[PDB]
Design an enzyme around this catalytic site. Structure first.
Site, PDB file in Angstrom:
ATOM      1  N   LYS C   5     118.017  29.686  91.841  1.00 44.23           N
ATOM      2  CA  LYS C   5     117.355  29.370  93.052  1.00 44.23           C
ATOM      3  C   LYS C   5     118.111  28.359  93.742  1.00 44.23           C
ATOM      4  O   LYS C   5     118.463  28.410  94.900  1.00 44.23           O
ATOM      5  N   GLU C  31     111.466  14.324  96.552  1.00 47.03           N
ATOM      6  CA  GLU C  31     112.239  14.851  95.501  1.00 47.03           C
ATOM      7  C   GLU C  31     111.819  14.148  94.284  1.00 47.03           C
ATOM      8  O   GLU C  31     111.447  12.989  94.306  1.00 47.03           O
ATOM      9  N   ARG C  32     111.851  14.848  93.163  1.00 42.36           N
ATOM     10  CA  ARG C  32     111.496  14.259  91.929  1.00 42.36           C
ATOM     11  C   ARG C  32     112.797  13.658  91.638  1.00 42.36           C
ATOM     12  O   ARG C  32     113.774  14.382  91.631  1.00 42.36           O
TER      13      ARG C  32
END
Lengths: 47, 156, 161, 264, 127, 131
Positions: C5, C31-32
């Site tokens: 992905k 965002e992590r």
């Protein structure tokens, strides 16, 4: 009917003893299959 | 909805139009198992009149009950009497239907108007199942059951 | 999640950045951070992030979870503003990777509520549509470029209406 | 209403869908077999009638129905049911025979000791000729034999369909007697009669199987239907769901806020 | 990775079809097997509470099933195996266990030694 | 020139096959039915089916029983109960069964049983015939 109406037996019975005897005979792998194909597997159950 | 929830209380006659039915294109489109009159209660109205209704009301209702079962299951492991009712109901359903007399502009049809007798009898006749070989939908958009009978007939 | 992905995205970035002379904005929206670190590393790895050019295919904006809701919400316009630069001004074909716009949505949404301001029903921003709108309308082919938005979308609650 | 209730539905409806589909392939296997295996039989049972439409039958007076053994049998059973209570009286006597315990499961429900015996294992593992011979045998000793019957089974046409077929009995030697039947002979009404016997099995087998062939594929059919149906239904709920689902939240937020539009 | 990847995967496969474990008790063998394997794999998923583990054990036991050896032994008896076999290897192939542990992977050898072990042990367990 | 339908439940061996003759252990006596044959049903003995196919073939079978159905026209329908190619029949058994049979006969008290036993004997014997 020498005994296929003259000692009981029907053509059905007579025959069926024959097939049965054929099953009695025959080679075993085939005899497995006996009870399958044309081996009586009626369950006489009224419902 | 509380608003209507309240309303019923106030109602001598609660008239519930069934959109569900309406959707079936049906007119009278009512939800009559929701539409009431307190004077719908035997005596008052001539209980026969009513009773004739009670059988119907029932019949349809039971028939309504079935609908989940049917919805999947359709038909063929159910029971026959029900199969009859189903059909009968189906006529009954149709029989309630009556086109618009005024709104021939809307209906195309001429609508109809039914006095009591044909009514009481009408459904009652269906209760007698006199039509059970007569085309079921033919009760659709009719007034008098007679004419409905006729509507079955021209077909067969 | 990274069905190749992430990679795919990287490839896209690759194709476009090239193919139209485009360039990209990546908004790692909420965002992590660790995963953005990680993210970094793929990009680096991939070389699409070139350390050999901060004129990689992608400009990165990371706006992690640890930032305020607002911060998480706003990084999106920030990026958006950038893409208008690259679009018009750099003439370029900007890609705006919004990742996830949903995570934005949430980030904004928190704000609306929290301002005591009635956000639309179920907490949805009052202005949810204008928030979106105000952002969204800043995306197009002007004449000096186009910012085509690549919107990572986590279908909230897998619910769409 | 509550998403719960809805789940009582949903849950199970999903379960069903799958299950229905389970029943489907299963049925299909049964079915699969049922075609294939039908072949020698096809011939064979077709064989039974060979001289029984070329042998012409003044039926001189064992009405039997052949159907499923199972729920999810469609109208396999019902069709024969109809068409066999309609009968039973003429061939004289109301005696009915059910091979297929779904035969007599609808015509169980409208006759019982007009049956002599009735058979299962027709479904729940598929019939055999032997069995046909067995029943063939029993039919005889029961003196309903010589009051004539018809043998009604679901004659398969295609998976979806069979046409409940019917024949009249030829296992009477009083058909093997006389008639124009005789004039087609150069052989006595004994070995003929012992064919009346033999053929009873052949046909019975055949028919028996025909029914079951009809049935098995219909059993899939049932299984198609349902699992699609289930699906549609699910879909609808699924909206209503979310809506209420959300609704709640809204209302809830409302209740809070409006509770924050109220004293504390 | 060598046992587990596959296992997960195997469980997936088992699992859609675990759906019709119930009925879908009548299909093709592959899948009937998948249930069997699956079930076997399941036993492994029955695991104690009051129970920690080393990797080598974990893989050991997995190895058995994923190498299908459990597909001989019957589900309940997997459980019997599981303790027993484990304790067995623990006892004997402690040698090996040290190695596997050490080697952090599964060596071909270790594998081979295992392979045989399990099979014999198994042969004994399922003896 | 006979459409030979030779079938058993299990098999159709010949199906309206242009067989010149089938030599028939119809209960009757040896008879070699060619072609069309009078509407008659004659019931079959256990025997061999020898299928003189119109071409020199004789296909071999042992037949358990069944019926021949001789339909006026070109068609013969041998509906043989268990008519098996001798291939799959078992000689070892034929004798053995016959001994066994001989054991049974004695207990095949009651002609209906006997009928079956004598049948069995006959069968086993008949298996001894060709096997």
């Amino acid at each position: 009917v020498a005994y296929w109406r003259q000692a009981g037996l029907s053509y059905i019975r007579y025959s069926q003893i024959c097939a049965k005897a054929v099953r009695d005979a025959l080679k075993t792998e085939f005899k497995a299959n006996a009870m399958k194909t044309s081996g009586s597997t009626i369950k006489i159950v009224k419902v | 909805d509380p608003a209507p929830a309240t309303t019923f209380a106030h109602l001598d006659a609660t008239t519930v139009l069934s959109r569900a039915i309406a959707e079936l294109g049906i007119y009278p489109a009512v939800d009559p198992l929701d539409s009431t009159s307190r004077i719908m209660d035997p005596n008052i109205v001539g209980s026969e009149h009513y009773d004739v209704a009670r059988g119907v009301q029932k019949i349809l209702q039971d028939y309504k009950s079935l609908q989940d079962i049917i919805a999947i299951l359709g038909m063929d492991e159910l029971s026959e009497e029900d199969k009859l009712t189903v059909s009968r109901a189906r006529k009954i359903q149709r029989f309630l239907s009556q086109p618009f007399q005024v709104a021939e502009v809307f209906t195309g049809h001429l609508g109809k108007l039914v006095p009591l007798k044909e009514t009481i009898k009408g459904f009652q006749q269906i209760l007698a199942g006199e039509y059970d070989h007569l085309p079921e939908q033919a009760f659709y958009m009719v007034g008098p059951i007679e004419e409905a009978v006729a509507k079955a007939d021209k077909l067969a | 999640a990274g069905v190749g992905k992430t990679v795919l995205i990287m490839e896209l970035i690759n194709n476009v950045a090239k193919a139209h002379g485009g360039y990209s904005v990546f908004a790692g929206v909420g965002e992590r951070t660790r995963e953005g670190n990680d993210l970094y590393h793929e990009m680096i790895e991939s070389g699409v992030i070139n350390l050999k050019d901060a004129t990689s295919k992608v400009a990165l904006v990371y706006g992690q979870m640890n930032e305020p809701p607002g911060a998480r919400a706003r990084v999106a316009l920030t990026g958006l503003t950038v893409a208008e630069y690259f679009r018009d001004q750099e003439g370029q074909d900007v890609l705006l990777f919004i990742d996830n716009i949903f995570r934005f949505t949430q980030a904004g949404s928190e704000v609306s509520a929290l301002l005591g301001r009635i956000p639309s029903a179920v907490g949805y921003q009052p202005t949810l549509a204008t928030d979106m709108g105000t952002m969204q309308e800043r995306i197009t082919t002007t004449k000096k470029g186009s910012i085509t938005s690549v919107q990572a979308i986590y279908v909230p609650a897998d619910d769409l209406t | 209403a509550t998403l719960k209730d809805i789940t009582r539905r949903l849950k199970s409806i999903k379960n069903i869908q799958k299950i229905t589909k389970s029943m489907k392939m299963v049925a299909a296997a049964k079915y699969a077999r049922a075609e294939r295996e039908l072949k020698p039989a096809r011939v064979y049972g077709v064989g039974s009638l060979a001289l029984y439409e070329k042998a012409d039958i003044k039926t001189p007076e064992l009405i039997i129905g052949v159907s499923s053994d199972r729920g999810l049998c469609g109208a396999i059973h019902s069709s024969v049911a109809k068409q066999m209570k309609s009968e039973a009286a003429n061939l004289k006597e109301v005696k009915i025979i059910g091979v297929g315990d779904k035969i007599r499961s609808i015509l169980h429900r409208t006759h019982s000791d007009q049956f002599l015996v009735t058979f299962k294992e027709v479904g729940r593992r598929p019939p055999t000729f032997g069995d046909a011979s067995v029943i063939a045998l029993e039919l005889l000793n029961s003196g309903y034999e010589f009051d004539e019957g018809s043998i009604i089974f679901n004659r398969f046409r295609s998976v979806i369909s069979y046409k409940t077929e019917e024949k009249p009995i030829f296992s009477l030697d009083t058909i093997s007697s006389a008639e124009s039947m005789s004039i087609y002979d150069d052989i006595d009404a004994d070995v003929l009669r012992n064919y009346q016997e033999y053929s009873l099995a052949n046909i019975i087998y055949y028919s028996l199987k025909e029914s079951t062939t009809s049935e098995q594929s219909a059993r899939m059919t049932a299984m198609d239907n349902a699992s699609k149906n289930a699906s549609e239904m699910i879909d609808k709920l699924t909206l209503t769901f979310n809506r209420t689902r959300q609704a709640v939240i809204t209302k809830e937020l409302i209740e809070i806020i409006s509770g924050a539009a109220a004293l504390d | 990775k060598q046992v587990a990847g596959t296992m997960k995967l195997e469980l997936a496969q088992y699992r859609e079809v675990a759906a019709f474990a119930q009925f879908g008790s009548d299909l093709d063998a592959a899948t009937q097997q998948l249930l069997s394997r699956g079930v076997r794999l399941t036993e492994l998923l029955k695991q104690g509470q009051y129970s920690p583990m080393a990797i080598e054990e974990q893989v050991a036991v997995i190895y058995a099933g994923v190498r299908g050896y459990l597909d001989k032994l019957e589900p309940s008896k997997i459980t019997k195996f599981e303790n027993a076999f484990l304790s067995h290897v623990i006892s004997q192939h402690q040698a090996l266990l040290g190695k596997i542990r050490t080697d952090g992977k599964i060596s071909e050898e270790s594998d081979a030694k295992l392979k045989e072990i399990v099979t014999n042990f198994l042969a004994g367990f399922e003896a | 020139q006979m459409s030979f339908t030779f079938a058993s439940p299990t098999q159709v061996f010949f199906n309206s096959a242009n067989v010149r003759q089938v030599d028939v252990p119809t209960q009757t006596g040896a008879f070699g039915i060619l072609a069309a044959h009078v509407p008659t049903l004659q019931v079959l003995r256990p025997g061999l089916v020898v299928v003189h196919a119109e071409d020199g073939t004789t296909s071999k079978y042992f037949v358990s029983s069944g019926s021949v159905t001789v339909n006026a026209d070109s068609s013969v329908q041998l509906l043989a109960e268990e008519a098996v190619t001798l291939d799959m029949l078992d000689l070892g058994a034929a004798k053995a069964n016959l001994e066994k049979a001989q054991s049974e006969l004695l207990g095949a008290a009651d002609e209906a049983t006997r009928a079956e036993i004598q049948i069995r004997i006959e069968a086993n014997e008949a298996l001894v015939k060709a096997l």
